[PDB]
Design a protein around this ligand. Structure first.
Ligand SMILES: [Mg+2]
Ligand SMILES: [Mg+2]
Ligand SMILES: [Mg+2]
Ligand SMILES: [Mg+2]
Ligand SMILES: [Mg+2]
Ligand SMILES: [Mg+2]
Ligand SMILES: [Mg+2]
Lengths: 70, 142, 103, 45, 199, 61, 138, 69, 10, 92
RNA sequence: UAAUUGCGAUAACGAACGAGACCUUAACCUGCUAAAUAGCCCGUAUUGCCUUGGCAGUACGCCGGCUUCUUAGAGGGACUAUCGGCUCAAGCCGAUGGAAGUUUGAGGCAAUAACAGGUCUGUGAUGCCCUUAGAUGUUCUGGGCCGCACGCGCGCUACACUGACAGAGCCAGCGAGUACUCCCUUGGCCGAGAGGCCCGGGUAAUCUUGUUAAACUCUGUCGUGCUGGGGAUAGAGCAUUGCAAUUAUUGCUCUUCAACGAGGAAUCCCUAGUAAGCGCAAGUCAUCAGCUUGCGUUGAUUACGUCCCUGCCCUUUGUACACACC
C-alpha cells in the first residue's frame, strides 16, 4: 500500500497552495479537493484526500522537512 | 381448525390415500401391469403389487398443487438417469403410455377434468373434496 | 381525432445517445398535456462469441471472447395517430425507431 | 421481417461491405473511413 | 403448537443439544484447552463458517463439525454433509448404549488421549536422514488424532459386513482407555518409538 | 516418566531446512525463573502450552 | 391501519421474500407449515431463531415467506436469514425497541450471520475451476 | 463364510436365552456370531420386536438398532 | 552403460 | 492517409528512409504530441529486417491505446517482393 | 513494497516506456427517476375445511394504491477511516465499526531487443521455379484417410455396504428458436420402447420455460460371494435422418455376463465456494460427445513458510567461453 508520484505531487502542491481551508478530517478534504481540482477518477480523488489528510496530522505536531506553506 | 393437503406429510398421506382407494377398489386396468418398464431409463418393474394405485394417488396429489399439467410435463417429472454403459449418464424421461393412461383413467373416477380451453387437465369441484376428506382422517389420527 | 395508444420500440448498442433521445422526447410530450407512461427498463441483451485465437494451432492454446450488447428502452403514449408523426422528428444517428399504432 | 438481434449483425456486415470496398476503390483520393445513417425509404452515405 | 412437543421439553431448560448435554466436562489435564472449543453449544454440526481464511481462525470452531468434515473422504464422499451428519449422530447414539457416561465425555477423552507428543523431522543428509525427533504442537496433535480416528473406521469397514455407523463408534470407545488394539494407537506408539530411536 | 509441562514465551524466527520447525523460548511453569530454547514442529502462538518428555536436551543457537 | 413490514433474505442464488403481519401467533412457510419444508436432518436448523428468543414474544405475529432458486441448503439458509430481519423490522418500526436491542444483541452474540449475508459464488476460468490440464513432459 | 438361510431349533434356542443379556442387537452382530443370513437377521428383528423383548431407540431405512426391555 | 555427454565431471 | 502518401512515395523510386522521415515532419506541424512508423520487409538483402521511427509521446498498455491512438497498416508490392507499413498517431 | 513502489543520501539535472493509473464484471442502497412483455397490497366473483372473525387456492381490475422482492439509468459508498503497541520518515502487525480491510475478488490490455519457432494447405497477401489440353486446373463414379503381432499421451466407466436396486419427496443458472422453407416446440390421440398422427403458440422478460436437471432426502429389497458391483464382446427384432447407413450413423427390447480387490519404478494439478462429486447450455451438426468453451447445485483436510531439488531477479567476483558449458 504505497502511493505513487502523481498523488505525492498533487498532495504537496494542494497543501502548499491551499493550507488553511482544509483540516485533519478526511470527509471535508474529500469535498475540498474535487471542487478546486480537475480529477478524472473517483478512487484517485479518494487517494489524494486520504493521503493529504495524513499530512496535517503530523504537521499539527511539529513541522516536517520538505513541506512549506504560507 | 380444519386441515388440507399442505398440512400433512406427503409420504404417509399418499400411503393413506392408497389404503383408502383400496376400499373402493374400482379403477380400470388394461393389463399393462407386470410387463411395463415404467420408464426407458429403468430396468426392473416395481416390487410392490399396487404401484398402479399408489402412482395414481400421488399424481392426483400433485395435480391438486398445480394449475395445469400435461403428459409431457409428467414425462420428465418422473424421469431419471440411465446407465448408458461406458459413456457418462444423462437425463431421459419415463414411459409415455403408462403415465398417459394412468391419468386418463383418473378423470372418469370424478377426481379431475379436462381443460380444453387452454390445455392440460385441472381438478374438479367434487374431485378435490376426495383428497380433502382424507386430510381430516389423517390429521386427528396423530 | 381518435386516440390509438401508440407504442414505439427502440434499439441501439450505445447507451448515452439513446438515453438522451428519450430524455429529450419526454418533455416534448409532457408539455403538450399528453398522458405519458414512464420509461420502462428492459433487460440488456448480451451476446458472446468464442473462437480459437491462434490461426494455425501451433504453440500454446488460448481463447478469446468477443461480445456485443443491445438495449431497447421502449416507450408508449396515448395520443391520436397524426400527432405522433411530428413528435418523433429530430433523431440522431445510430438509433433506429419502430412505430406501432396498437389500435 | 427479421429479428433485431440478427438485424444488428446484418447491418454491421453491410457497413463492413462499404468500408472494405472503398479501400479497394478510393485509396488514391485519401479515403479515411465512412459513416452511414439509415432512414425510411431513403439512405445517405 | 408451532414447535414440536419434543423440543418443547428442552426449551424450558438451559440451551444444550437435544439428545445430550454439554455440562460436566472433564478435568483430566491441560495444554489441550484454548484449542478445543466447547463454550458455545450447537444443535447440528453443519454450518457455513469462515474458518479457512486466517491461521488460527479454525482453533475456535466446534470439534464435532471437525469430525464431520474428516468423516467424508476418499473421493466419492466429498461435500455429503447430510450423509455424514447422520453417521456422527448415530455413532454418538451407539456409544451411549455401551456405557452410561456421556458420548461427548468419551469422545473428548479419546481425542485428548490419542494425540502424539513427539515426531521425526526430515533434515537432509545427502541421501541420509538426520531425524531430530522434534515435539508436536497441540493443534497439530488434535489434527492428526482426528485423521487417525477417521481413517481407522474407513479401513476397517472397507469390504466388511459391518457398517460405518458402529464401526466409527467402536474406535471411540476403544480409544477412551489404553486399549492398545486400535489402528490409531498402533501409529501413535510406532511414531513415538521411532522418535525415541532417532533422538 | 516424569513428564513436564512448559509454555512458550517468545518466537525467534523460523529455522530448519524446510521451515517446518520453529525455534522458541519456553518457560517451565513450575520454576518461573528457568527458561530454555527448544524446537517445535507445528504452529505456535504466544502463551501456548507444550508437553515435554525430556528437558535436558538443547537445540542449536 | 394494518401493521405489516416486508423483508428479504438472500443466498448464493436463493431468494426468500417474507411478509410480517400482525396476527395471532401463526407461522407457515411457503403456505405449508414448518413441519414439512426442510430435509429431515436439517429440520433442526429452522427452529433455533424461535426458541432462542422465546415463543411468548410471538403472541400476535404472522409471517408468510416465498422462496425460490438455489439448492436445498440454500433455501433453509435464506429463510433463516430472512426471519431475523422480519422480526427486528417489525419490532423496530411498530413497538418499543427496548425489546429490540436486547433481542439483537443476544441473537448476534450467538451468531453474527443472522443479520448479514455471506457472499460466495464461483470464478470463471479457461480450464475449469482453478486447475489446468495434465502436462506431457512438464 | 456361508451363512444359514433357514433357522432351526439349534439356532432358535440361542435367541431367547441370549438376547436377554445382549446390550445391543444389530444385523452385524447376528450375522457375526449367530452365523445367519442378513435377511434372516432382519426377519428376527421384526418378529421379536412384537413379542415384547426389545425397544426401539432409532429407526432408519438403512440401519436399525434395538436394546433390552 | 551411461552416456558421457552433458559435461558432467568425475 | 499519411500511410497511403508514404505508399505512393515509396512505390515511385525514392529512398525508404527519406519517405519515412518526411512523414515525421508532416505530422509535427499538425500538432500531434507523438508518432511512430514501422516498416518491415526485405531491406536490400536476402534476409529480411524492419525499422522503426518514433518521436514524441507513446502509450502501450491501457484501453486509452484503443481510442487515443489511430493506427493503420498497408502492404506495398515491389519488383522483388512485398513490404509492410504500420503507422500510429496519438491525437490530444 | 507485489513492483526501477517509495523514503532518502548523492556528479548529476531534467525527461520518455513498463508497473500503477485505466476499462468490464462480481459484492452495498427500505434514498432519486420508473415499470400489465416483472411483482406486491387492495377490491369483486368463486372453491374447500373449521365454521371465526379464520386458513388454503382460482379468475378478473389497465388511472384503486405502491416498487421491498425482478430490471438498469443518474449518483453515493473504502480511504486503510478510528484506536493500541514499534519507527524521524516510508511502512508493518492487532482490534472495533462497517455489505466490503490481500491492490475488496477475478479478468481485458500490456515495454526494448530478439527465435533461421509455426503458417505459401485461410486469404484475388506474395518472389522465384514447375505442370499448363495425354492437365498438378475443374468435374462425375467407386474405394481409402477407421486398415493391425507392438511401445507412448489427454480422457470416460469401475473394482462395491461411505454400495446397488425399487417406490415416494423435490430445488438452479448462463443460453438458443420460424425460410423463399419449416427452426426450438405446448396441448390431444395412437403406440411396450424408440416413435407416429392432429389443432395451436413464439421472429421471442409475452410461447417453448418455473426449461420443477443431477446430486440429494424418506421408506423398502439384496447381504461381501469378484454376487443383484462391473458392462467388454456377440445373436435376433423394431424405428427415425439422408441421394445413399455394408466396415452396422444413431435409438429401443430380449439374450450372451469377459477383464477388473485401490495398482511397481516413475509422474501431473491445486490455497475458499477453492479441490473433488454431479449436471446443464453453446460450438462442429440432416443424425452422432467419451471433445472444448461457459453456467449453476452440494462443498472439504493441512500451510500462511523456506530456497533443499527444478527455475527466476539484483550486486560483488573468476574465466584460455562470444556458434557463448550441448
Ligand atoms: Mg503506462
Ligand atoms: Mg495495468
Ligand atoms: Mg513484455
Ligand atoms: Mg455376474
Ligand atoms: Mg450438443
Ligand atoms: Mg581462477
Ligand atoms: Mg568478465
Amino acid at each position: 500500500r504505497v502511493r505513487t508520484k502523481t498523488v505525492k505531487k498533487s498532495a504537496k502542491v494542494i497543501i502548499e497552495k491551499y493550507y488553511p481551508r482544509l483540516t485533519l478530517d478526511f470527509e471535508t478534504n474529500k469535498r475540498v479537493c474535487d471542487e478546486i481540482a480537475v480529477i478524472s477518477s473517483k478512487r484517485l480523488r479518494n487517494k489524494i484526500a486520504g493521503y493529504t489528510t495524513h499530512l496535517m496530522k503530523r504537521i499539527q505536531r511539529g513541522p516536517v522537512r520538505g513541506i512549506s506553506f504560507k | 381448525g380444519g386441515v388440507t393437503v399442505r398440512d400433512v406429510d406427503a409420504h404417509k398421506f399418499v400411503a393413506a390415500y392408497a389404503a383408502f382407494l383400496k376400499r373402493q377398489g374400482k379403477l380400470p386396468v388394461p393389463g399393462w401391469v407386470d410387463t411395463v418398464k415404467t420408464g426407458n431409463a429403468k430396468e426392473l418393474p416395481p416390487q410392490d403389487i399396487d404401484w398402479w394405485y399408489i402412482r395414481a394417488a400421488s399424481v392426483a396429489r400433485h395435480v391438486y398443487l398445480r394449475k395445469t399439467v400435461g403428459v409431457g410435463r409428467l414425462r420428465k417429472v418422473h424421469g431419471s438417469a440411465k446407465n448408458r454403459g461406458t459413456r457418462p449418464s444423462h437425463h431421459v424421461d419415463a414411459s409415455g403410455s403408462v403415465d398417459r393412461k394412468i391419468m386418463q383413467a383418473l378423470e372418469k373416477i370424478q377426481v379431475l377434468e379436462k381443460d380444453e380451453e387452454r390445455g392440460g387437465r385441472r381438478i374438479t369441484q367434487q374431485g378435490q373434496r376426495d383428497l380433502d376428506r382424507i386430510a381430516q382422517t389423517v390429521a386427528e389420527a396423530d | 381525432p381518435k386516440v390509438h395508444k401508440i407504442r414505439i420500440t427502440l434499439t441501439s448498442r450505445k447507451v448515452q445517445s439513446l438515453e438522451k433521445v428519450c430524455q429529450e422526447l419526454i418533455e416534448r410530450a409532457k408539455n403538450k398535456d399528453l398522458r405519458v407512461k414512464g420509461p420502462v427498463r428492459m433487460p440488456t441483451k448480451t451476446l458472446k462469441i468464442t473462437t480459437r485465437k491462434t490461426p494455425c494451432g501451433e504453440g500454446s492454446k488460448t481463447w478469446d471472447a468477443y461480445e456485443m450488447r443491445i438495449h431497447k428502452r421502449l416507450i408508449d403514449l396515448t395520443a391520436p395517430t397524426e400527432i405522433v408523426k411530428q413528435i418523433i422528428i429530430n433523431i440522431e444517428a445510430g438509433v433506429e425507431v419502430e412505430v406501432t399504432i396498437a389500435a | 421481417q427479421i429479428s433485431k438481434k440478427r438485424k444488428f449483425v446484418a447491418d454491421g456486415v453491410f457497413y463492413a461491405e462499404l468500408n472494405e470496398f472503398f479501400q479497394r476503390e478510393l485509396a488514391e483520393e485519401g479515403y479515411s473511413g465512412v459513416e452511414v445513417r439509415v432512414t425510411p425509404t431513403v439512405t445517405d452515405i | 403448537d408451532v414447535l414440536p412437543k419434543e423440543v418443547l421439553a428442552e426449551v424450558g431448560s438451559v440451551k444444550l443439544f437435544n439428545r445430550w448435554s454439554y455440562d460436566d466436562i472433564e478435568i483430566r489435564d491441560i495444554s489441550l484447552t484454548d484449542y478445543i472449543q466447547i463454550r458455545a453449544p450447537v444443535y447440528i454440526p453443519h454450518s457455513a463458517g469462515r474458518y479457512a481464511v486466517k491461521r488460527f481462525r479454525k482453533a475456535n470452531c466446534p470439534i464435532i463439525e471437525r469430525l464431520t468434515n474428516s468423516l467424508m473422504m476418499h473421493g466419492r464422499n466429498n461435500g455429503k454433509k447430510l450423509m455424514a451428519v447422520r453417521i456422527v449422530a448415530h455413532a454418538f447414539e451407539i456409544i451411549h448404549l455401551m456405557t452410561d457416561q456421556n458420548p461427548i465425555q468419551v469422545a473428548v477423552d479419546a481425542i485428548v488421549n490419542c494425540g502424539p507428543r513427539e515426531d521425526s523431522t526430515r533434515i537432509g543428509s545427502a541421501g541420509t536422514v538426520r531425524r531430530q525427533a522434534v515435539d508436536v504442537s497441540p493443534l497439530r496433535r488434535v489434527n492428526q488424532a482426528i485423521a487417525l480416528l477417521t481413517t481407522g473406521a474407513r479401513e476397517a469397514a472397507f469390504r466388511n459386513v459391518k457398517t460405518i455407523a458402529e464401526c466409527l463408534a467402536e474406535e471411540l470407545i476403544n480409544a477412551a482407555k489404553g486399549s492398545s488394539n486400535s489402528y490409531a494407537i498402533k501409529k501413535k506408539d510406532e511414531l513415538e518409538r521411532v522418535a525415541k530411536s532417532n533422538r | 516418566a516424569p513428564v513436564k509441562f512448559v509454555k512458550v514465551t517468545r518466537v525467534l524466527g523460523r529455522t530448519g531446512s524446510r521451515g517446518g520447525v520453529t525455534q522458541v523460548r519456553v518457560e517451565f511453569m513450575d520454576d518461573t525463573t528457568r527458561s530454555i530454547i527448544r524446537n517445535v514442529k507445528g504452529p505456535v502462538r504466544e502463551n501456548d502450552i507444550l508437553v515435554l518428555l525430556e528437558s535436558e536436551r538443547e537445540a542449536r543457537r | 391501519s394494518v401493521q405489516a413490514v416486508q423483508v428479504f433474505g438472500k443466498k448464493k442464488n436463493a431468494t426468500a421474500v417474507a411478509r410480517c403481519v400482525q396476527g395471532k401467533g401463526l407461522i407457515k412457510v411457503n403456505g405449508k407449515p414448518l413441519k414439512l419444508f426442510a430435509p429431515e436432518i436439517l429440520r433442526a436448523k429452522l427452529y433455533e431463531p424461535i426458541l432462542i428468543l422465546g415463543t411468548d414474544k410471538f403472541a400476535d405475529v404472522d409471517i408468510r415467506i416465498r422462496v425460490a432458486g438455489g439448492g436445498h441448503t440454500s433455501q433453509v439458509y435464506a429463510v433463516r436469514q430472512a426471519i431475523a430481519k422480519s422480526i427486528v423490522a417489525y419490532y423496530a418500526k411498530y413497538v418499543d425497541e427496548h425489546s429490540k436491542n436486547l433481542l439483537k444483541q443476544e441473537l448476534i452474540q450467538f451468531d453474527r450471520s443472522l443479520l448479514v449475508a455471506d457472499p460466495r459464488r464461483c470464478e470463471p476460468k479457461k480450464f475449469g475451476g482453478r486447475g489446468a490440464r495434465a502436462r506431457f513432459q512438464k | 463364510a456361508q451363512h444359514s438361510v433357514i433357522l432351526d431349533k439349534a439356532t432358535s434356542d440361542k435367541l431367547y436365552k441370549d438376547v436377554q443379556s445382549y446390550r445391543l442387537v444389530t444385523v452385524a452382530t447376528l450375522v457375526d456370531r449367530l452365523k445367519i443370513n442378513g435377511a434372516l437377521a432382519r426377519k428376527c428383528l421384526k418378529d421379536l420386536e412384537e413379542k415384547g423383548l426389545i425397544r426401539q431407540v432409532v429407526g432408519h431405512s438403512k440401519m436399525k438398532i434395538y436394546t433390552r426391555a | 552403460r551411461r552416456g558421457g555427454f552433458r559435461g558432467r565431471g568425475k | 492517409a499519411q500511410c497511403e502518401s508514404l505508399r505512393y512515395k515509396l512505390l515511385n523510386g525514392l529512398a525508404v528512409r527519406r519517405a519515412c522521415y518526411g512523414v515525421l515532419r508532416f505530422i509535427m506541424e499538425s500538432g500531434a504530441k507523438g508518432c511512430e512508423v514501422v516498416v518491415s520487409g526485405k531491406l536490400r538483402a536476402a534476409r529480411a529486417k524492419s525499422m522503426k521511427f518514433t518521436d514524441g509521446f507513446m502509450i502501450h498498455s491501457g484501453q486509452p491505446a484503443r481510442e487515443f491512438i489511430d493506427t493503420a497498416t498497408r502492404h506495398v508490392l515491389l519488383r522483388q517482393g512485398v513490404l509492410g507499413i504500420k503507422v500510429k498517431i496519438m491525437r490530444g
